[PDB]
Amino acid sequence: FQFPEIAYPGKLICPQYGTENKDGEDIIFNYVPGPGTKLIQYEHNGRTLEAITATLVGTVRCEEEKNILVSVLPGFANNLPKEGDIVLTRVTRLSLQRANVEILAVEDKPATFSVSQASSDLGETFRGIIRSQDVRSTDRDRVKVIECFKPGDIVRAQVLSLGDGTNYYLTTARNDLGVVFARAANGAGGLMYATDWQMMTSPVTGATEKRKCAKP
Amino acid sequence: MVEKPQLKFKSPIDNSESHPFIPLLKEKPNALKPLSESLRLVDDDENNPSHYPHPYEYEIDHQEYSPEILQIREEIPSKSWDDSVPIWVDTSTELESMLEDLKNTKEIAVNLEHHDYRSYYGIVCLMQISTRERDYLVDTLKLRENLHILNEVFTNPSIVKVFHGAFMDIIWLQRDLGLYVVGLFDTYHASKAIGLPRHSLAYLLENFANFKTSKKYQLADWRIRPLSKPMTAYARADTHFLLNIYDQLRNKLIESNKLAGVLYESRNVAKRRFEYSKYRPLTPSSEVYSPIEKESPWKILMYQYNIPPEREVLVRELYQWRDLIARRDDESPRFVMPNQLLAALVAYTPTDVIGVVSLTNGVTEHVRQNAKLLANLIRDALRNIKNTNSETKADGILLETISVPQIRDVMERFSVLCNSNISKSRAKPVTNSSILLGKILPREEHDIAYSKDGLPNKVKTEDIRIRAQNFKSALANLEDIIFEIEKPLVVPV
Amino acid sequence: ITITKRNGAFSDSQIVTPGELVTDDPIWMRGHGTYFLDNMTYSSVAGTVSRVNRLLSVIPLKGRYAPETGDHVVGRIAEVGNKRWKVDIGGKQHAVLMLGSVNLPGQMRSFLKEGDLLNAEVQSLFQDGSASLHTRSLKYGKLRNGMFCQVPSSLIVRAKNHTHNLPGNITVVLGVNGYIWLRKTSQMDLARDTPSANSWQIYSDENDPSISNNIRQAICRYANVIKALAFCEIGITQQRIVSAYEASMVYSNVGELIEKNVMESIGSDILTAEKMRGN
Amino acid sequence: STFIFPGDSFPVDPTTPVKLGPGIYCDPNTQEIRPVNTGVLHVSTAYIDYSSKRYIPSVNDFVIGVIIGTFSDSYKVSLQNFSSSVSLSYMAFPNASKKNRPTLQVGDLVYARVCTAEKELEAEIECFDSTTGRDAGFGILEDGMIIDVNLNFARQLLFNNDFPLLKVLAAHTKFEVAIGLNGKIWVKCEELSNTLACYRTIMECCQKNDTAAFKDIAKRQFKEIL
RNA sequence: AAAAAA
Ligand SMILES: [Mg+2]
């Protein structure tokens, strides 16, 4: 690519704009900053200059989407809950009109996941709230939250809107979303598995608790 | 059914709104400022257009209250509810008797009744005025254009008018009856100053009166004559004990020095001016009332029923037509067509006269006769929405703006920048040998396993690798747990 | 650098003090600064006795800005939560700004965020004295294209219009709260009161791309004279500013106006001029 | 009497179906029934009576609470100090309304029953039974005086009609009374001296805890104020 | 950071 492949923080990669000559016509390559890069200003020969500079140690990748995107891939931080993403959460508390949780991991894109490492005994972990209307598409008005989720149960959901900078708004309306892993009696009993979409049973003690289950 | 009083009125209703609201005030008693000076029009600002100002605006602010409202007097117990009887006034012969009866009183308690279902602007139905020793029920239907003579009492600063939530009462007074209030004392604002839990009228009749009442007849039709027993019970109950509460609240305010604030907010209520939706100020305020305070009233209708910004032209015509008929036959917009039924016209969009008549639960009378026209407005709106139906472009003009050979210049200045910067680096090679903690701190993780002899054995680094390979392979594909349950209720074919 | 070294040390208006009986007449209506106790009226603060009509009160010598309905004020966003904005107008409490009290064009932090200045009107008042702000106007909105300066709230009196245009192509926004904003005269500022007798860029954070030095030093000088008039405890009006701006032209450099002897000179010049041509 | 200790074997055979209750615990894994408290096992129905000063939310229980907060959705009422708050809805009152809200300030005494009480959810009460003529004394308790007692003294007073308290107090004075299952007793009389006489009796009766000492205490208390 | 009339 006529540009350095390996880049340490502070290493010059490519100028602001670029162009080449092919097929008897000038093709304009537009370089734009990305994750790991930062467009800054340098001075030389008594004249200002703007060039793409890597800010993270790793390899440079030049890709195009249907313009040249310059980004640096390290050998987590970039991953952050955005509208449409699927996120594994754990129920922290149950209220009557809603159910608040905390974000643990986020599903990637083509399964693999991105685990967000944080202290659960502090509160530094991202918190999210699942509305009672976002529990299931069936009968959106009247939904008993006690018979859907449970403190400690793992819930796979999808984030709708970020809202403010405190809580995320999730939903379990579709089939592949709902309580995934759970135990009997708030975790006191044995492991339970998902059979019906609105019923969770335990093939060990024969206990059956009402939850919101996803599709296997 | 019930005959509307609009036909029985001496003057026909006018829903044209072609001219700014002109007060029906003919005689202006207790006024230090001439009527001719207040009958003019205010200069048009940016937000405020040309309109007639409040007649007693100069009288409300400038005039002083009676010095007996500023002193703490003992409460005056209300007359017995069972012993006292309400006096009905349906003729002008007994209206004059009440007028001279109110002039010898220190304070009066007045509350209105309104019906906005069979009229566009709405019509004042019942006015209940109560003194210390008697109660009155004034009919505002038959006696309407002759109630302007009550302004001698209502605009007199010597007599204290006791209302509750007069924010809508002052409007109804000046619009239909042409009445104005000078020297108002709103018990509602008084309740706010004390910090009472509920600023309603039912709470004041409970805590400071111990007369249990309830909200039963409010939206109910008051045009029905004569008045029934539970309705006339609620009618007189509003202003009966109101004078008792007036003293009790007035004593609360003086000792807490909050009386100045209540009378202040009361005057601002009394100076409220009514104006049509067309000639309303462009800036929303609480001093001017209008049926529609938004330039685009169809906006909030769409966002409520989640209507996308595409059928706005459809809901506009349906709204403007609903307002046109309502101002024609002199009816309420909801009586012509409810918002729920209008939503069915926007959501389903019936192209024929068959789909218009049958929607949801029921259909009103106004849109039933004009159902054929409604089928055309939908066909016109759908025709309109189908009639109407920059990323690299904005960048491309900027790339042709900057010089092309300059790109070769900034590249040469970039190549000469790197070669004169990072290309020059020379220093004697120094080993990374540990000085102190560099030997032990970054130590690779080792594991040991004690055998039967008790001798330490270093676990191979390859041993743990195949352990992870065995775990990750077994965890990735879990064996499906199969368990059978007996079903004696099922049978074969 | 200027220093001051001192060693050894560190129809009449009635002046009342807390606890003093102002009048023995219970007829009067109790106002601010006075409390009621057994038909007697005592003063709670120290100041002048204000007798207006039936209302009796005591005006304090010094006090924070008291918000009134219709006041044109300049405020800064203090915090943003739920569906409201709480703006600091330098009062006793933070004024509130509802979501329905602003202009929505066709995540509230994308419109107004902490730190942003704005000018607004007091729509109404709460029971605790807090003010409800209202920005729905062509004269109100988010502030930019200039600089902020603060003067005592008792130096700016109410008026029909608080936005004045001044020579030098700049515009002042005299808030009743004392918060003042100087800015470059825009299209709205040039023709505002005149056309009356004849929208995503309103929340923008970026100033005008072309700010001439002639305007920057004007904004600068206009700021130095206002704080100078405030230094002499002189009520700031549109005329007092223009006069001070012209009277300060005898000083070539703008930086010379920061001195104490210079500020009191410009202040005394206007006081003596308005007294001479006023009588 | 048969005294029970936690962890001890359960005398009742697992063969015959027996309904559970308070005092016993069903192990979510081993599925064995064991006692978790100390007291007397009552078998008719299987439950254990144990001494406790702290009340826990439970369905169909009459409680006397104090309004500690007023929200827009419901009321915040504390049935006991330091315990979690309870949710009293606006529609939980007789003759309910939409726009119009019932008149209750912070500190008002309310006599209501617990409708829905989950262990992992905020409890809820209603000021109208479901139902007993809508009037079991439910509603705002005007004036009067309340007294804190243990849960043992409260339940036996409300349920058991052989308890010589309301029987012995009715002879000394005429009054209306309301007893909650959270250890709260509300008693209102005409004269203040009578209410004070009733407060001192229950205070001493709960302390000594003797069935035959009720008449003795009540005699000397009412003659003390005079 | 709900509230008042009808
Ligand atoms: Mg009323």
Q: What is the CATH number of the domain that holds B16?
A: 3.30.420.10
CA A57 to each of CA A37, A60, A80, B170, C54: distance values in angstroms, whole numbers, following the listed order? 10, 9, 21, 74, 79
- Cα C151 off chain centre by: 7
Residue with tokens 């390996």: A6
Residue A115 has φ and ψ, to the nearest 5°, of: -80, 120
DSSP codes, D141-181: --S-EEEE--HHHHHHHHS-TT-TTHHHHHHH---EEEE-T
End-to-end CA distance of chain C: 40
Is residue B226 reached through a cis peptide bond, with omega within 30 degrees of 0 on the bond before it?
A: yes
With contacts defined as CB-CB under 8 Å, which chain B residues touch A66? none
H or E element, residue B223? none
With contacts defined as CB-CB under 8 Å, which chain A residues touch B399? 17, 28, 30
Residue ending a domain, among B295, B325, B341, is B295
Instruction: Determine how β-strand D33-35 pairs with β-strand A199-201.
Output: unpaired
The one-letter code for the residue type at B174 is Q
Cβ of residue B395 closer than 8 Å to a chain A Cβ: yes
Q: Is B202 helix (H, G, I), strand (E, B) or coil?
A: helix
Subunit contact D103:B215, Cβ cutoff 8 A = no
What's the topology of domain A76-216?
OB fold (Dihydrolipoamide Acetyltransferase, E2P) (2.40.50)
Q: What angle do CA B308, B309, B310 make, to 5 degrees?
A: 90
Residue with tokens 């949780």: A101
User: Which of A18, A19, A45 faces B413 most closely, judged by CB atoms?
Assistant: A45
Count of CB atoms situated within 10 Å of the CB of A12: 21
For ligand 1, the distance from its centroid to the CA atom of residue B154, given in whole angstroms, is 17
Q: Which nucleotides of E are covered by protein (CB under 7 A)?
A: 1-6
Alpha carbon dihedral A142, A145, A146, A150, in 10-degree steps, equals 160
Provide the chain C residues 25-64 that lie in CB contact (below 8 A) with chain B: 26-31, 34-36, 53-55
- Whether residues B9 and B145 share a domain: the answer is yes
Range of the domain at B203: 1-295
H or E element, residue B398? helix B391-399
Say if C102 falls within a structural domain: yes
B165 touches strand E (CB under 7 A): yes
The residue in chain A having the minimum alpha-carbon distance to the alpha carbon of residue B422 is: A11
DSSP codes, B256-315: TT-HHHHHHHHHHHHT-EE--STT--SS--SSEE-S--SS-TTHHHHHHTT--TTTHHHH
- Whether residues C43 and C112 share a domain: the answer is no
- Whether residues B17 and B132 share a domain: the answer is yes
CATH number at residue D35: 2.40.50.100
Range of the domain at D42: 1-52
Alpha carbon dihedral C261, C263, C269, C270, in 10-degree steps, equals -160
Q: How far apart are CA B141 and CA B154, in angstroms?
A: 19
- Whether residues C33 and C167 share a domain: the answer is no
- Whether residues B309 and B239 share a domain: the answer is no
Contacts of B7 (CB under 8 A, 6+ apart): none
- Whether residues B262 and B308 share a domain: the answer is no
> C60 forms bridges with which residues in the sheet?
C47
Subunit contact C54:B70, Cβ cutoff 8 A = yes
Q: How far apart are CA B237 and CA B354, in angstroms?
A: 50
Residue D130: both structure tokens together:
């479901």
For ligand 1, the distance from its centroid to the CA atom of residue B191, given in whole angstroms, is 15
- Whether residues D91 and D137 share a domain: the answer is yes
Greatest alpha-carbon span in chain B: 124
The one-letter code for the residue type at A97 is Q
- Whether residues C44 and C162 share a domain: the answer is no
Contacts of D46 (CB under 8 A, 6+ apart): D12, D18, D19, D20, D21, D24
- Whether residues B76 and B213 share a domain: the answer is yes
> B115 forms bridges with which residues in the sheet?
B123
- Whether residues B302 and B228 share a domain: the answer is no
Residues across chain B: 493
H or E element, residue B391? helix B391-399
Residue ending a domain, among D117, D143, D169, is D143
Say if B56 falls within a structural domain: yes
The one-letter code for the residue type at D135 is D
> B124 forms bridges with which residues in the sheet?
B114
> D145 forms bridges with which residues in the sheet?
D187
Range of the domain at C84: 66-188+202-279
With contacts defined as CB-CB under 8 Å, which chain D residues touch B211? none
CA to C1' distance (Å), from B484 to E3: 61
Provide the chain B residues 185-204 that lie in CB contact (below 8 A) with chain D: 197-198, 200, 202-203
Contacts of A98 (CB under 8 A, 6+ apart): A129, A130, A131, A132, A145
For the packed helices B312-326 and B339-347, what is the interaxial angle rounded to 10 degrees? 140
- Cα B340 off chain centre by: 18
- Whether residues C153 and C236 share a domain: the answer is yes
- Whether residues B315 and B249 share a domain: the answer is no
CA C89 to each of CA C63, C111, C172: distance values in angstroms, whole numbers, following the listed order? 14, 19, 17
- Whether residues D150 and D132 share a domain: the answer is no
- Whether residues B76 and B100 share a domain: the answer is yes
Q: Nearest nt to B220, CA vs C1'?
A: E6
- The structure was resolved to a resolution in Å of 3.3
Q: How far apart are CA A68 and CA B362, in angstroms?
A: 61
Q: How was this structure determined?
A: X-ray
Q: Is B31 helix (H, G, I), strand (E, B) or coil?
A: coil
Say if C193 falls within a structural domain: no
Sort B394 into a burial class: Cβ within 10 Å, 0-12 / 13-18 / 19+: exposed
Q: How far apart are CA B54 and CA B38, in angstroms?
A: 8
Whether the Cβ atoms of residue C164 and residue C210 lie closer than 8 Å to each other: no
Burial B172-183 (b: 16+ CB within 10 A, else e): bbbbbbbbbbbb
B199 touches strand E (CB under 7 A): yes
User: Quick check: do D and C touch, 3+ CB pairs under 8 A?
Assistant: no
Chains that touch D (3 or more CB pairs under 8 A): A, B
With contacts defined as CB-CB under 8 Å, which chain C residues touch B256? 36
Residue with tokens 């979501």: C99
Count of CB atoms situated within 10 Å of the CB of B191: 25
Alpha carbon dihedral B159, B160, B166, B169, in 10-degree steps, equals -10
Q: Percent helix, strand, coil in chain B (nearest 5)?
A: 35, 10, 55
With contacts defined as CB-CB under 8 Å, which chain A residues touch D32? none
Closest residue (CA to C1') to nucleotide E3 in the complex: B199
Alpha carbon dihedral D1, D5, D7, D11, in 10-degree steps, equals 0
Which residue in A91, A78, A77, A103 sits closest to A162, CA to CA? A103
CA D218 to each of CA A64, D62, D152, D197, D203: distance values in angstroms, whole numbers, following the listed order? 93, 26, 20, 8, 11
- Whether residues C58 and C100 share a domain: the answer is no
The residue in chain B having the minimum alpha-carbon distance to the alpha carbon of residue D99 is: B215
Residue ending a domain, among B389, B409, B424, is B389
CATH number at residue D86: 2.40.50.140
- Whether residues C60 and C85 share a domain: the answer is no
Q: Determine the number of helices (DSSP H) and then strands (DSSP E) in chain B.
A: 20, 10
The alpha-carbon gap from B71 to the nearest alpha carbon of chain C, in Å, equals 6
Which residue in C242, C202, C212 sits closest to C225, CA to CA? C242
With contacts defined as CB-CB under 8 Å, which chain C residues touch B263? 29
Whether the Cβ atoms of residue C214 and residue C169 lie closer than 8 Å to each other: yes
Q: How far apart are CA B448 and CA B451, in angstroms?
A: 10
The alpha-carbon gap from B407 to the nearest alpha carbon of chain A, in Å, equals 6
Residues after which chain D is broken (C–N above 2.5 A) are 44
The 3-class SS string of C59-126 reads EECCCCCCCCCCCEEEEEEEEEECCEEEEECCCCCCEEEEHHHCCCCCCHHHCCCCCCEEEEEEEEEC
Contacts of C161 (CB under 8 A, 6+ apart): C193
Closest residue (CA to C1') to nucleotide E2 in the complex: D72
Q: How many domains are contained in chain B? A: 2
Sort B441 into a burial class: Cβ within 10 Å, 0-12 / 13-18 / 19+: exposed
For ligand 1, the distance from its centroid to the CA atom of residue B291, given in whole angstroms, is 20
Half-sphere exposure of B450 (CA within 13 A, CB side): 3
Q: What is the CATH number of domain A1-75?
A: 2.40.50.880
Residue with tokens 């007993």: D132
D119 touches strand E (CB under 7 A): no
Cβ of residue A189 closer than 8 Å to a chain D Cβ: yes
Domain residue spans of chain A: 1-75, 76-216
Say if C88 falls within a structural domain: yes
Q: Nearest nt to B186, CA vs C1'?
A: E4
The one-letter code for the residue type at B127 is M
With contacts defined as CB-CB under 8 Å, which chain D residues touch A146? 118, 120-121
B59 touches strand E (CB under 7 A): no
Which residue in A47, A40, A5 sits closest to B409, CA to CA? A47
Q: How far apart are CA C119 and CA C132, in angstroms?
A: 13
Whether the Cβ atoms of residue A81 and residue A126 lie closer than 8 Å to each other: yes
Contacts of B139 (CB under 8 A, 6+ apart): B88, B89, B90, B126, B127, B225
Q: How many domains are contained in chain C? A: 2
Residue D116 has φ and ψ, to the nearest 5°, of: -115, 120
Residue ending a domain, among B242, B273, B295, is B295
Count of CB atoms situated within 10 Å of the CB of C146: 23
Q: How far apart are CA A110 and CA A91, in angstroms?
A: 27
> B330 forms bridges with which residues in the sheet?
none
- Whether residues B245 and B378 share a domain: the answer is no
B219 touches strand E (CB under 7 A): yes
Q: What is the DSSP letter of B173?
A: I
B111 touches strand E (CB under 7 A): yes
Which ranges constitute the DSSP H helices of chain D? 151-158, 166-172, 192-208, 214-222
Q: How many domains are contained in chain D? A: 3
Say if B486 falls within a structural domain: no
Residues across chain A: 216
Say if C2 falls within a structural domain: no
Q: How far apart are CA B126 and CA D146, in angstroms?
A: 48
- Whether residues C124 and C245 share a domain: the answer is yes
Whether the Cβ atoms of residue C199 and residue C103 lie closer than 8 Å to each other: yes
DSSP codes, chain C: -------S------EE-TT-EEES-TTSEE-TTEEEETTEEEESSSEEEEEETTEEEEEESS------TT-EEEEEEEEEETTEEEEE-SSSS-EEEEGGGS-----GGGTS-TT-EEEEEEEEE-TTS-EEEE--SSS-EE--SEEEEE--GGG----S--EEEETTTEEEEE-TTSEEEEEE--HHHHSSHHHHH---GGG-----S---HHHHHHHHHHHHHHHHHHHTTPPP-HHHHHHHHHHGGGSSSGGGGGSHHHHHHHHHHHHHHHHHTT-
- Whether residues C107 and C225 share a domain: the answer is yes
Which residue in C171, C217, C215 sits closest to C191, CA to CA? C171
- Whether residues B7 and B116 share a domain: the answer is yes
B167 touches strand E (CB under 7 A): yes
Subunit contact C127:B192, Cβ cutoff 8 A = yes
Residue D147: both structure tokens together:
């007294």
Contacts of C226 (CB under 8 A, 6+ apart): C149, C151, C172, C180, C236, C241, C244
